[PDB]
């Protein structure tokens, strides 16, 4: 046990040992970016692959060309925190070494005349943060992996839903990574046709003529030949035994049936069969036949032989006739009929047809047609069947060679055609398009590589154009490359792509799920309107790869999925899952990763399968699955086993206790809504958990984890300093590990990100131990909500439907109080009239509103501000404004007039109250800094100097401690050394050479220390004091951060982990709440009626288990309170941890007295229990735990009404539930508008709370009003509330005058529509 785990050991109710621990959750991102960004000698992945695919490039004439040598990544300008502060992208320079080599025109081609080496800048490459995120424009973003179709050839059918009859049409479709798409389909007339990028159908023969195939060659490829001869003036047929198995049969020794089995008479074997002449009449020729004397073609290929043809070939002297084979079941005439319907007769007639169907309405020429067909499929530049695509094609068509090729060839097309005809004939099956072996995962690295290749090509066109000019003596490689296109491509992908999504940062679980999400949408993917039932469905190959539960509930159902717990991506992008090998009947611990294709043949057992002590199966017949179907199979036939019970579900589904007792519909809701939880002030562990929380907390990166072991030298709420152990020190290292903790940083969803130390100074820590807890983390465990006392009963209709009744106590102790940090920006710009200034001299504002402002006009830090308060004072120059004559008289009477500038200042939004916790001022270079700017500037320098000095002090302390140990290897007295003053050590004079040399070495080391510290300080000072690159026309920016404590209130949405959501209806007083015999009131009263209909029974089991766990907690609390002996504490803890026949062996005897006391102290507030999914705690264990805690085994207590004191007639289920506060707050959902802004064109109210807009009265609302008959209300909504400008103004005036009447007019939208219809040359008018 690790120290952090040893502090609080969670009781495990699981029964099945775990062989493979869950891997790092964010591998799918880090591995992909490492593939993209690291240098690979084989040049198959990442930047090297793009460079080698693009370079070398050649001038069209051939004078010179540019070559690629190597690439490197420079040092980032800023760090991640700095990039977030300023608002820049965290990236590294791309510096690529290239050779411009110029040949000699006079010399033979290939002679090197001159070479030029130079390094060129190719743009900035965004970097992946250690947690798998990107910092783009100061924002954390996540790039979602994509599920697409692998390149290659797929065979499909229409399932008999196109033609009038059944007639299931068959098609074959080849799609490359890049290039054109090729389709070979069947028609209702059984002739195979071709499409090239989905255009009008053409006969198939063209695609072979172009490959140089004559008709006879085509029938040779697509047909089997049967031969006939003239032997002894008789017809002779080349008998094959398999073919025969309606006429008279020759070979009189073994005559078969005549015009009325086969194997018995074919056992002997003969070769001579005689056939009637009619047997040739209905059969087609196969070889073109020429007569020397005539010089003409007697019979052509694909022509039906007739009696007259028999006569011609009899007189011509030809005796051997080879003809085609045609059946109705096994072989077909499809190719012959397609040749018959073909109109092209030669290669050129084929390319002209391809050119007409390529470019309709264009004169066809031979050279253009040849170039077009070469570029369509046989050109490397425009066609690239990738390595995955080539493997899929080779596996589909059964080809073994040409693994490196990426361009099609004759063999490929002829094999695709052969497989299509075979699948028609009956041998072969179509492909499952939703099969996970046919779908590929494309991650961040692949997409970045593709976009970088696009940028390279866009640069490369211009490079090739320039090189052809010829004047190249004074040029350099850096004068040929423009980095702007490549930069534009990479920022396009990283900032504007659909799959580059804004980070979800409510809690660690949201981040982890976002990083492990796969989308079928995006570029090269699906569309919501074009997605059907089949793609949204749960396939049998999703087992262990995609979670069947976690998916958005809405239009995106089934199109966005989550990675499974143990899922992985192979080198080709196909999802694979681990399995345990079964060898010689034993279930080994060796693990093999299997993909969808490999999984089908083997039969795989389940983690639920019983096992013996020897390691083999116990039940003779075990439940397994093979080829996608489940069933019962013998023990000896079993090849593989599942590694864990949570293999099929995602992390969020793995965090739901008692998941096996919940319906999948509610499990979906629970998994989705665990990601919307908001961190609270105090993080509380889940009493009933699954044992997964530690993995999520550690792998999310929100916590501070120890890089090396040692003892905690120093602890403070913002800094943890660890003295590294001696065994884990790099030679010549300081020995200090410093962890600076994030304190109150705004998240992407305006939620607090705070790290709280969980260590004490002097305690030992090891590698992987949690030093500080991030948001929603408790001692290294994920803590999304709070443990609430729950009573399942109706209470006076306040829990009607899904409503929740909450006690006031929950509000008092702030169990669901959250901190929200909000950013407010004031931008002082430059206008035509003048430059806007940030000053406190705000016209028409008294000193009451200027109290919180400083001299520079910026609010102080720590000021309590409410709605409407001024944060930053800004005045904008204004031009001359005309005054109405009444206003002129008013100014004449009272002479006050001060309107040189107008008040456009940043103010606190309404209904927002908080404190100012940070103010940041950005000033353009060349603009004077106001006093507040220099105040923050000097504060930043003071902070940086103090912290740099602190790190220097600790590292020097550690280094001098190591040096002291090295000296103590010999041993002297340090009192004599301390007698001389520390600086005076440099003033010592030594005459012996041995001591003098050491003195010089020490002086040099001191100088080097000074130099390195100086360089660090100069770098930081330059970074801090430099100007900010702002938007053109912008002079200053001021950013203010507001912290709001939001408390629970009616309208807030609270939910559990079982899909049980609700809205708080009442904050009940404590006296009114139900209470038990000991006077303890409940905290939340839930409606029981929700449970039976929604089949979420896991919540009841969680309630009972939480009751038992809390009861054990009170037992430990009492046993500590009475200062009872430690031995009985140990006995009680051992009894608790030995409950049930579990896999957990916790020995309290091996724990020290201090460790036992700490464990008991962490267990006072309840005993955490782990119930793994599908390996959870049975009812018997729950009842035993309840019996241990001196609680009823039924889990139901006697509750008394607080209002009356009378006991409820029936026992009520009371326990503890883990409840969450979702990010759906009534504070952010109220909105009301009387009159506000209006649209520019439609003159209608804006939309949204941010715009202070109005609600939409849609078509159905108008329908309802018409059904009621409220004509005047409908007219009010249409005219005087939306777009009748004069009408709405007079309506407001009438309401102010207390008249309550309206003069409706014409809506502006109708006038706009009339103007549009007039603009279309259509006269629309109104008559009287």
């Amino acid at each position: 046990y690790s120290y952090t785990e040893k502090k609080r050991i969670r009781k495990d109710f699981g029964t099945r040992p775990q062989v493979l621990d869950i891997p790092y959750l964010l591998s799918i991102q880090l591995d992909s970016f490492e593939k993209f960004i690291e240098q690979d000698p084989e040049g198959q992945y990442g930047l090297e692959a793009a460079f080698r695919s693009v370079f070398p490039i050649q001038s069209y004439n051939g004078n010179s060309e540019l070559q690629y040598v190597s690439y490197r990544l420079g040092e980032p300008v800023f760090d991640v925190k700095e990039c977030q502060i300023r608002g820049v992208t965290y990236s590294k320079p791309l510096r690529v070494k290239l050779r411009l080599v110029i040949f000699d025109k006079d010399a033979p081609a290939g002679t090197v005349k001159d070479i030029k080496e130079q390094e060129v800048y190719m743009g900035e490459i965004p970097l992946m943060t250690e947690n798998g995120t990107f910092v783009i424009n100061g924002t954390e973003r996540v790039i979602v992996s994509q599920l697409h179709r692998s390149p290659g050839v797929f065979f499909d059918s229409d399932k008999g839903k196109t033609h009038s009859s059944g007639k299931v049409l068959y098609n074959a479709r080849i799609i490359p990574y890049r290039g054109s798409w090729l389709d070979f389909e069947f028609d209702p007339k059984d002739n195979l046709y071709v499409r090239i990028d989905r255009r009008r159908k053409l006969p198939a023969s063209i695609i072979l003529r172009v490959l140089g195939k004559t008709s006879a060659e085509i029938l040779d490829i697509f047909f089997e030949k049967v031969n006939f001869e003239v032997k002894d003036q008789t017809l002779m047929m080349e008998l094959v035994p398999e073919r025969l198995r309606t006429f008279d049969i020759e070979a009189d020794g073994k005559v078969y049936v005549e015009k009325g089995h086969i194997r018995q008479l074919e056992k002997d074997g003969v070769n001579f069969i005689e056939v009637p002449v009619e047997y040739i009449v209905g059969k087609v020729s196969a070889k073109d036949y020429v007569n020397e004397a005539t010089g003409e073609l007697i019979i052509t290929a694909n022509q039906e032989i007739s009696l007259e043809a028999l006569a011609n070939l009899s007189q011509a002297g030809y005796k051997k006739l080879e003809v085609l084979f045609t059946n109705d079941l096994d072989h077909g005439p499809f190719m012959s009929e397609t040749l018959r319907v073909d109109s092209t007769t030669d290669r050129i007639s084929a390319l002209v047809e391809i050119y007409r169907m390529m470019r309709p309405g264009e004169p066809p020429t031979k050279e253009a047609a040849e170039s077009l067909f070469e570029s369509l499929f046989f050109s490397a530049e425009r066609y690239d069947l990738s390595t995955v695509g080539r493997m899929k094609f080779n596996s589909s068509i059964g080809r073994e060679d040409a693994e490196e090729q990426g361009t099609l060839d004759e063999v490929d097309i002829i094999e695709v055609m052969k497989k299509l005809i075979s699948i028609r004939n009956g041998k072969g099956e179509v492909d499952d398009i939703d099969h996970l072996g046919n779908r590929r995962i494309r991650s961040v690295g692949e997409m970045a590589e593709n976009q970088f290749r696009v940028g390279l090509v866009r640069v490369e066109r211009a490079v090739k154009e320039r090189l052809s000019l010829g004047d190249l003596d004074n040029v350099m490689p850096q004068d040929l490359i423009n980095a702007k296109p490549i930069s534009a491509a990479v920022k396009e992908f990283f900032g504007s792509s659909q799959l580059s999504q804004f980070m979800d940062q409510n809690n660690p679980l949201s981040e982890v799920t976002h990083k492990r999400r796969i989308s079928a949408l995006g570029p090269g993917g699906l569309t919501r309107e074009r997605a059907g039932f089949e793609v949204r469905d749960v396939h049998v190959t999703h087992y262990g790869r995609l979670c069947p539960i976690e998916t958005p509930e809405g239009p995106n159902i089934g199109l966005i999925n989550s990675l499974s717990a143990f899922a992985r991506c192979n080198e080709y992008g196909f999802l694979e899952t681990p399995y345990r090998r079964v060898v010689n009947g034993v279930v080994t611990d060796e693990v093999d990763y299997l993909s969808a294709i490999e999984e089908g043949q083997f039969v795989i057992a389940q983690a639920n399968a019983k096992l013996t002590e020897e390691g083999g199966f116990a039940d003779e017949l075990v439940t397994a699955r093979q080829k996608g179907e489940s069933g019962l199979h013998p023990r000896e036939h079993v090849d593989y086993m599942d590694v864990a019970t949570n293999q099929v579900v995602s992390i969020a589904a793995s965090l739901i206790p008692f998941l096996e007792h919940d319906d999948a519909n509610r499990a979906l809701m629970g998994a989705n809504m665990q990601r919307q939880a908001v961190p609270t002030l105090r993080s509380e562990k889940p009493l009933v958990g699954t044992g997964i929380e530690r993995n999520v907390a550690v792998d999310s990166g929100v916590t501070a984890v120890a890089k090396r072991g040692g003892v905690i030298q120093s602890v403070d709420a913002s800094r943890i300093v660890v003295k590294v152990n001696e065994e884990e020190l790099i030679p010549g290292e300081a020995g200090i590990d410093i962890y600076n903790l994030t304190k109150y940083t705004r998240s992407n969803q305006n939620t607090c990100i705070n790290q709280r130390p969980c260590v004490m100074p002097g305690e030992p820590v090891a590698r992987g131990d949690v030093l500080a807890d991030g948001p929603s983390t408790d001692l290294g465990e994920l803590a999304l909500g709070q443990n609430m006392r729950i009573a399942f009963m109706p209470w006076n209709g306040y829990n009607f439907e899904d409503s929740i009744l909450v006690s006031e106590r929950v509000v008092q102790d702030d169990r669901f109080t959250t901190i929200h940090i909000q950013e407010l920006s004031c931008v002082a710009r430059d206008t035509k009239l003048g430059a806007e200034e940030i000053t406190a001299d705000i016209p028409n504002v008294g000193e009451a509103a200027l109290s919180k402002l400083d001299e520079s006009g910026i609010v102080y830090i720590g000021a309590e501000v409410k709605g409407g308060d001024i944060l930053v004072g800004k005045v904008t120059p204004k031009g001359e404004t005309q005054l109405t004559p009444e206003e002129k008289l008013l100014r004449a009477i009272f002479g006050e007039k001060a309107s040189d500038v107008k008040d456009t200042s940043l103010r606190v939004p309404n209904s927002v109250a908080g404190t100012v916790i940070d103010v940041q001022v950005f000033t353009r270079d060349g603009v004077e800094k106001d006093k507040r700017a220099l105040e923050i500037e000097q504060m930043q320098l003071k902070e940086a100097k103090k912290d740099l000095t602190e790190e220097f002090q600790i590292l020097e302390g550690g280094l001098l401690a190591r040096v002291r140990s090295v000296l103590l290897a010999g041993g002297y007295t340090e009192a004599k050394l301390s007698s001389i003053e520390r600086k005076k050590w440099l003033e010592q004079t030594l005459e012996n050479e041995e001591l003098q040399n050491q003195l010089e070495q020490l002086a040099e080391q001191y100088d080097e220390l000074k130099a390195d510290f100086d360089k660090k300080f100069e770098a930081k000072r330059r970074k801090i004091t430099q100007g900010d690159d702002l938007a053109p026309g912008v002079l200053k920016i001021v950013k203010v951060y507001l912290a709001v404590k939001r408390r629970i209130q009616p309208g807030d949405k609270m939910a559990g982990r079982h899909g049980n959501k609700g809205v708080i209806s009442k904050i009940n007083p404590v006296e009114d709440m139900p209470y038990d015999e000991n006077g303890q009131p409940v905290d939340i009263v839930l409606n029981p009626l929700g449970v039976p209909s929604r089949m979420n029974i896991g919540q009841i089991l969680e309630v009972h288990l939480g009751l038992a766990a809390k009861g054990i907690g009170d037992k430990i609390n009492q046993m500590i309170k009475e200062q009872q002996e430690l031995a009985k504490l140990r006995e009680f803890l051992q009894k608790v941890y030995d409950l049930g026949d579990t896999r957990q062996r916790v020995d309290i005897s091996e724990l020290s007295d201090e460790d036992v006391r700490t464990l008991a102290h962490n267990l006072r507030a309840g005993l955490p229990v782990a119930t793994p999914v599908f390996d959870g705690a049975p009812e018997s264990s729950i009842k035993a735990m309840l019996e241990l805690a001196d609680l009823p085994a039924s889990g139901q207590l006697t509750l008394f009404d607080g209002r009356t004191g009378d006991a409820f007639e029936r026992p009520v289920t009371v326990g503890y539930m883990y409840m969450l506060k979702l990010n759906h707050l009534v504070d952010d959902k109220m909105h009301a508008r009387s009159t506000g802004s209006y649209s520019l064109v439609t003159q209608q109210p804006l939309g949204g709370k941010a715009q202070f807009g109005g609600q939409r009265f849609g078509e159905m609302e108008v329908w309802a009003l018409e059904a009621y008959g409220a004509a005047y209300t409908l007219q009010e909504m249409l005219t005087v509330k939306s777009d009748d400008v004069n009408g709405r103004t007079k309506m407001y005036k009438n309401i102010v005058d207390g008249n309550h009447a309206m003069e409706p007019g014409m809506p502006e939208s109708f006038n706009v529509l009339l103007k549009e219809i007039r603009s279309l040359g259509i006269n629309i008018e109104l008559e009287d």
Binding site: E1266, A1271, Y1272, D1284, P1304, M1306, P1307
Partner: peptide, 23 residues
């Protein structure tokens, strides 16, 4: 066009219109 619907409360109003157009 923002006028009253010829149904319910507005119905009689529209009736008056065809009382005027007829005359």
């Amino acid at each position: 066009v923002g006028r009253l619907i010829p149904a319910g409360t507005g119905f009689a109003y529209h009736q008056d219109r065809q009382a005027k157009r007829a005359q």
